[PDB]
Write a protein that binds this DNA or RNA. Structure first.
Ligand SMILES: [Mg+2]
Ligand SMILES: [Mg+2]
Ligand SMILES: [Mg+2]
Ligand SMILES: [Mg+2]
Ligand SMILES: [Mg+2]
Ligand SMILES: [Mg+2]
Ligand SMILES: [Mg+2]
Ligand SMILES: [Mg+2]
Ligand SMILES: [Mg+2]
Ligand SMILES: [Mg+2]
Ligand SMILES: [Mg+2]
Ligand SMILES: [Mg+2]
Ligand SMILES: [Mg+2]
Ligand SMILES: [Mg+2]
Ligand SMILES: [Mg+2]
Ligand SMILES: [Mg+2]
Ligand SMILES: [Mg+2]
Ligand SMILES: [Mg+2]
Ligand SMILES: [Mg+2]
Ligand SMILES: [Mg+2]
Ligand SMILES: [Mg+2]
Ligand SMILES: [Mg+2]
Ligand SMILES: [Mg+2]
Ligand SMILES: [Mg+2]
Ligand SMILES: [Mg+2]
Ligand SMILES: [Mg+2]
Ligand SMILES: [Mg+2]
Ligand SMILES: [Mg+2]
Ligand SMILES: [Mg+2]
Ligand SMILES: [Mg+2]
Ligand SMILES: [Mg+2]
Ligand SMILES: [Mg+2]
Lengths: 386, 136, 88, 143, 154, 61
RNA sequence: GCGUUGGAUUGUUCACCCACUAAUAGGGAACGUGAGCUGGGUUUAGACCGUCGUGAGACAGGUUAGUUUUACCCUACUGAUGAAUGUUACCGCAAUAGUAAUUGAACUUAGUACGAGAGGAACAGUUCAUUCGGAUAAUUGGUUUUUGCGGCUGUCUGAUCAGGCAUUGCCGCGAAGCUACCAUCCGCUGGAUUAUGGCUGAACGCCUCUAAGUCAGAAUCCAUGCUAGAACGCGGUGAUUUC
RNA sequence: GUGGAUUAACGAGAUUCCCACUGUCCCUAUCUA
RNA sequence: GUGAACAGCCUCUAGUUGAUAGAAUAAUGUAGAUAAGGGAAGUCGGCAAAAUAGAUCCGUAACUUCGGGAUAAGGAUUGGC
């Protein structure tokens, strides 16, 4: 017999299996399509999530009820120090897919990437890339042969970059490596750009700018083993029912004589890799501005670091991206920021944001002062001050 | 469908399910209103229809004038008492749930509204704004 | 009413995409590339300041590499173990 | 909170405020308007036997007499004594609208203060004259 | 965009912070935080609660009336626009704050003037009692000398 | 004999995931190893060149 | 492809009513889900009324009260490890399997087209909301063994102090953590088609969208995009022992 | 065909409404052993 | 001791300190709790929980076998010195 009361299904079946990710660094599965007449550009960046705050913007959006009005919005801050280029990989199009055929590295790598290549760094003799460093001796010619091979073959060019983890307040000491696709023109000019940029840094101002919508790729916060009520969003059975009530009552019928793949069991919740699109960039801030937490309606000398530091993170002290809204993953996790995969035809992707105020009160507690001078001026002189 | 309301209504926290008593805030002759339906609400299994500030509901009169009772009429919610958010950022709430009697075209039956009126309701309904002296 | 995959909606969006949105994307691209060139230039000037402070066809026969030279020196385990796609 | 203050101080169980009662106790016309109430079906003594300080309605008049003798009423009377703490006090404590608050304070110690005290004196003697030889049972006749 | 004052508790209220209650007279009470708001709902006295500016001014812990406090008013009649007048206002604000902090520190240093004489009097009374507890100290000091000097003799 | 035993990292040395620490069995086997060492020493053999060549556990009543 | 409600009411359900709604379509899966759970039955024994019987008793006539109580096994399903292919490490490819968004208003077009009048559209350009989904915790609310700070009652430690006990004694506030349409953010565009509308054109010296050929066209199909990654699918690259 | 018909008080007897009150519910979340 | 009290709670004399233990803090349980706005819309059925509660003073209906109903209903209070 039919159900007699229709209801939509609990949960999305295209996000299966709800299992743990294979790494902390979520992988980029698509890049913007190459246009061989534009200049050479990088298409993604990688940084660290450091907390949230609140802003006030003056809104200009014709046709809405908040046209020429002030609006309070939540934003997320990503700590983005420069990235440093260390290699290049070429890919050939095979009738089974793309196949990497050649990798070239730089002559002088660093201790952070060497730490990435080791598991027990405190005992090792640090022998990595020691024979590869001899390939650059006077002629060498293996480097030039490999770069000539990438120029001749290899219809897709990716650059190997690593982070500057020692410029963050983290304890990890051990940098992250990633491949970033180059989408300029002229395969030869792509690998010439890469070979010129070996052992040098790229800032986020050379990849992104304000009023642009980007995508964020990260692994979400983990929660362990979870029951069906919070893992899937089902109803609760009434009260004091036999063998519990945080359960699904009927998991199958007579026929088929199996449990089906869509009938909501218990298991792992969180620690999944997710891609979220269309997040607008509200501020690209520099690490030496000394008033990068100020606006043209605030007139106070302060940075974006809140009063007492970001909770579980620390100070900023670097360049940063300030995007609108929520981002997957928790604080101090590694995030990949990707450029837009298509040309957006909305006016939201075409507006120009004007910040009016940035909140810098304490998030460790109920903060109600923005600067310590404001706290000292409100409270007055104390017993230890005199 | 959405008759009498000028423009659109943005999302506000719903306070009043079906089966709530609210005050009557105009001088038409009623004392309280019993909410039996909400105009323009979605369909979901087990979910109650709920009204918020600035919505048209179908209500009955339980206390008040003997002529007004035993009939169903449109009403508009003007005070909520469940805290909602303004977009210029603060949360705020009133002291009570209150509404006024209206026809289906949005026009009001009484002549004056006592107490304050939420500015979202007054911006959404022009005949509510013309009959109120205190707007938040 | 109309879905995401409606044809008339997608055609009107295509015309809109060919216009002012594509113009804005091109302008932002040129600004980003100019920033990147200035970044590389300032870095090379900093390295030059450090230096002035202190002091035919390229043919192909065989690659190099650890695992590659291992597989090259092996070159027999596949046809010895009766495996290896494209050969018997 | 826990359970007690949630049960008592809920928004649908809110009681009247001290500065509203202070403006009620000023202006003798408002005192006469609060003493001469009409009939009301939803008030305990049909809208009669109302205490102005403790803004509540009594069942009988003998209930009002014993309430006026009690110790809760004296707490409310002692609360309704001086300058009644509006937002002007919070503003001037922050250092804002200070001259306006000072004008308000000297105005309440010049004019509105002794008027409130004289109205409260007249009201106390009127209630003591009326609630003297009252019976305990009530005529339900509302006229 | 405005900074408001907490109604119960007189602290600054920034956008997106706290809650507001609208009474039936269109009187709006904005609250600093949930502590100030719940004390309001339980009907406690702000002139009695010691952690508020109202208590501190009424009790005389802080200076309450001064010429530097007669500057921030609600200005209901606006002036047109003048770049020079705005720049003069932004300079005068910093000068006014500097003067006000100096006068506030002077008020505190005046009201805390006897805390050296009172401490000397209680210390001299404590020393003037219990003489044999000062002989344990006299033995303890002489034992600290001789034992260390013959350890420094080694 | 390992149905529904917990897992631990200390099995990785032997290639398994399930391993335990049986204290009483370890004490008894240590007593027999000490007795066999004393027996070979009373016979007069090299203690550094001895290896366990046969061991057998069998059920009792 | 996608949705199809909240109640009321007779033993129950359908049907029927009251609304709201874009709409409140119809069916199957042991009339899905009587040892997943429950009211009533299967299912007795106590008792009363009506009718029948001389009587014991009977009645599927009416009304009350009434004992079945796995899972630790195999498989299926949901998640989690793992030997072996020289060793060990890092960066990738993508076969296959799954897939996701959906409805309603508002401005403008425009009081226009159309119409004696009464009335009254739409394409292009913009703005919000309903249902669903994936996250997130700046702010608001909830929660407190932070037993963090303060108080209250009874009793005990001679009193002050500092505390014990009261099955977390009670009351107020309470960070951090968790969490809520009770809070906030985000949710694409290419090819082939169906019904239909056509072009050229025979069969059949006329004609015909069809027979050969061909141009478009549905929320459809296959992709793009999104999730997983064959533990017996693959690639590139680093370093290779000291007795 | 003129045990039958009422009945205050009492009841772990059976049925139906009202006021108060609430996590029964919308719609779930958190904490202790 | 508190208290109307051989109630519950704390203590003196006397007696016991027995009942497999260690480490962590997933889901589901058993035993308890709190929850904004609404207030039975839930369910066969307000099941369960909440709300009430001691004492003083005021006051108390129909009906009745005149004995009752009756703590009917409803209200004002309660510390310390
Ligand atoms: Mg159906
Ligand atoms: Mg792909
Ligand atoms: Mg915080
Ligand atoms: Mg199409
Ligand atoms: Mg086990
Ligand atoms: Mg087990
Ligand atoms: Mg509906
Ligand atoms: Mg059943
Ligand atoms: Mg079953
Ligand atoms: Mg029977
Ligand atoms: Mg029974
Ligand atoms: Mg596929
Ligand atoms: Mg779907
Ligand atoms: Mg259109
Ligand atoms: Mg969720
Ligand atoms: Mg809180
Ligand atoms: Mg304490
Ligand atoms: Mg004590
Ligand atoms: Mg205790
Ligand atoms: Mg909290
Ligand atoms: Mg939500
Ligand atoms: Mg075609
Ligand atoms: Mg694999
Ligand atoms: Mg007889
Ligand atoms: Mg006694
Ligand atoms: Mg006792
Ligand atoms: Mg509640
Ligand atoms: Mg009910
Ligand atoms: Mg019902
Ligand atoms: Mg129902
Ligand atoms: Mg019960
Ligand atoms: Mg009775």
């Amino acid at each position: 017999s039919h159900r007699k009361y229709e209801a939509p299904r609990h949960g999305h079946l295209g996000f299966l299996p709800r299992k743990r990710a294979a790494s902390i660094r979520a992988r980029v599965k698509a890049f913007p399509k190459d246009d061989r007449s534009k200049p050479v550009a990088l298409t993604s960046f990688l940084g660290y999530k450091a907390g949230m705050t609140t802003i006030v913007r003056d809104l200009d959006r014709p046709g809405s009820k908040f046209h020429k009005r002030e609006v309070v919005e939540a934003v997320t801050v990503v700590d983005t120090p420069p990235v440093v280029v260390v290699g290049v990989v070429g890919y050939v199009e095979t009738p089974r897919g793309l196949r990497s055929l050649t990798t070239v590295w730089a002559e002088h790598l660093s201790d952070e990437v060497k730490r990435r290549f080791y598991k027990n760094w405190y005992k090792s003799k640090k022998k990595a890339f020691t024979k590869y460093s001899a390939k650059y001796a006077q002629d060498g010619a293996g480097i030039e042969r490999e770069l000539a091979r990438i120029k001749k073959y290899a219809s897709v060019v990716r650059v190997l970059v690593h982070t500057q983890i020692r410029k963050t307040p983290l304890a990890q000491k051990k940098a992250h490596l990633a491949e970033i696709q180059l989408n300029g023109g002229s395969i030869s000019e792509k690998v010439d750009w890469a070979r010129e940029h070996f052992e040098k840094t790229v800032a986020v101002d050379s990849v992104f700018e304000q009023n642009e919508m980007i995508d964020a790729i990260a692994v979400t916060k983990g929660h362990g083993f979870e029951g069906v009520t919070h893992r899937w969003g089902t109803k609760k059975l009434p009260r004091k029912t036999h063998r519990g009530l945080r359960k699904v009552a009927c998991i199958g019928a007579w026929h088929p004589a199996h449990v089906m793949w869509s009938v909501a069991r218990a298991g792992q919740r969180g620690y999944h890799s997710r891609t979220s699109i269309n997040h607008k960039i509200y501020r690209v801030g520099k690490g030496d501005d000394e008033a990068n937490g100020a606006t043209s309606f605030d007139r106070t000398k302060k940075t974006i670091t809140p009063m007492g530091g970001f909770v579980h993170y620390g100070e900023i002290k670097n360049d940063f991206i300030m995007v609108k809204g929520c981002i997957p993953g928790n604080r101090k996790r590694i995030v990949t920021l990707r450029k837009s995969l298509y040309t957006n035809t909305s006016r939201k992707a075409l507006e120009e944001v004007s910040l009016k105020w940035i909140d810098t009160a304490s998030k460790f507690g109920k903060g109600r002062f923005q600067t310590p001078a404001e706290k000292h001026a409100f409270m007055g002189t104390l017993k230890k001050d005199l | 469908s959405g008759n009498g309301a000028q423009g659109t209504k943005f999302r506000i926290s719903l306070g009043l399910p079906v089966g709530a008593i609210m005050n009557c805030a105009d001088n038409s002759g009623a004392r309280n209103l019993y909410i039996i339906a909400v105009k323009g609400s979605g369909s979901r299994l087990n979910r109650l229809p709920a009204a918020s500030l600035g919505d048209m509901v179908m209500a009955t009169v339980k206390k008040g004038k003997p002529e007004l009772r035993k009939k169903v009429m449109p009403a508009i919610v003007v005070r909520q008492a469940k805290s909602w958010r303004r977009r210029d950022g603060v949360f705020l709430y009133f002291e009570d749930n209150a509404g006024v009697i209206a026809n289906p075209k949005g026009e009001m039956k009484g002549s004056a509204i006592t107490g304050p009126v939420g500015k979202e309701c007054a911006d959404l309904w022009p005949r509510v704004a013309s009959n109120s002296g205190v707007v938040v | 009413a109309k879905s995401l995959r409606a044809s008339s909606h997608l055609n009107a969006k295509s015309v809109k995409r060919r216009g002012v949105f594509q113009k804005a994307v091109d302008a932002r691209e040129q600004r980003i590339s100019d920033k990147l060139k200035e970044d590389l230039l300032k870095q090379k000037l900093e390295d030059l300041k450090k230096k002035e402070e202190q002091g035919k066809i390229s043919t192909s026969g065989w690659r190099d590499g650890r695992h590659h030279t291992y597989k090259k020196a092996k070159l027999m385990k596949q046809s010895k173990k009766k495996t290896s796609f494209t050969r018997f | 909170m826990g359970r007690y203050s949630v049960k008592r101080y809920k928004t649908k169980r809110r009681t009247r405020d001290l500065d509203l009662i202070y403006n009620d106790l000023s202006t003798k016309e408002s005192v006469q308007k609060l003493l001469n109430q009409p009939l009301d079906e939803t008030k305990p003594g049909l809208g009669q036997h109302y205490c102005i300080h403790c803004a509540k309605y009594m069942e009988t008049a003998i209930a009002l007499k014993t309430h006026l003798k009690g110790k809760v009423h004296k707490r409310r009377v002692k609360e309704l004594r001086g300058v009644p703490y509006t937002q002007e006090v919070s503003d001037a404590a922050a250092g804002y609208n200070l001259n306006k608050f000072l004008n308000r304070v000297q105005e309440i110690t010049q004019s509105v203060g002794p008027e409130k005290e004289s109205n409260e004196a007249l009201l106390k003697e009127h209630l003591d004259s009326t609630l003297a030889n009252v019976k305990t049972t009530e005529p339900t006749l509302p006229w | 965009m405005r900074i408001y004052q907490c109604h119960f508790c007189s602290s600054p209220c920034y956008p997106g912070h706290g809650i507001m209650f609208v009474r039936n007279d269109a009187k709006e009470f904005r609250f600093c935080r949930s502590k100030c708001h719940k004390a309001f709902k339980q009907r406690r006295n702000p002139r009695k609660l010691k952690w508020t500016k109202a208590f501190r001014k009424a009790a005389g812990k802080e200076l309450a009336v001064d010429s530097t406090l007669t500057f921030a008013q609600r200005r209901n009649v606006p002036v047109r626009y003048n770049r020079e007048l705005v720049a003069t206002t932004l300079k005068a604000m910093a000068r006014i704050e500097e003067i006000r902090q100096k006068r506030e520190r002077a008020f505190y240093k005046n009201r805390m003037r006897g805390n050296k004489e009172k401490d000397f009097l209680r210390d001299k009374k404590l020393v003037e009692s219990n003489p044999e507890l000062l002989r344990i100290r006299e033995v303890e000091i002489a034992r600290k000398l001789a034992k260390e000097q013959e350890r420094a003799e080694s | 004999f390992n149905s529904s035993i917990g897992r631990t990292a200390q099995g990785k040395e032997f290639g398994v995931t399930k391993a335990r620490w049986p204290a009483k069995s370890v004490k008894f086997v240590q007593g027999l190893l000490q007795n066999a060492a004393a027996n070979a020493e009373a016979k007069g053999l090299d203690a550094t060149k001895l290896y366990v060549s046969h061991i057998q556990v069998n059920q009792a009543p």
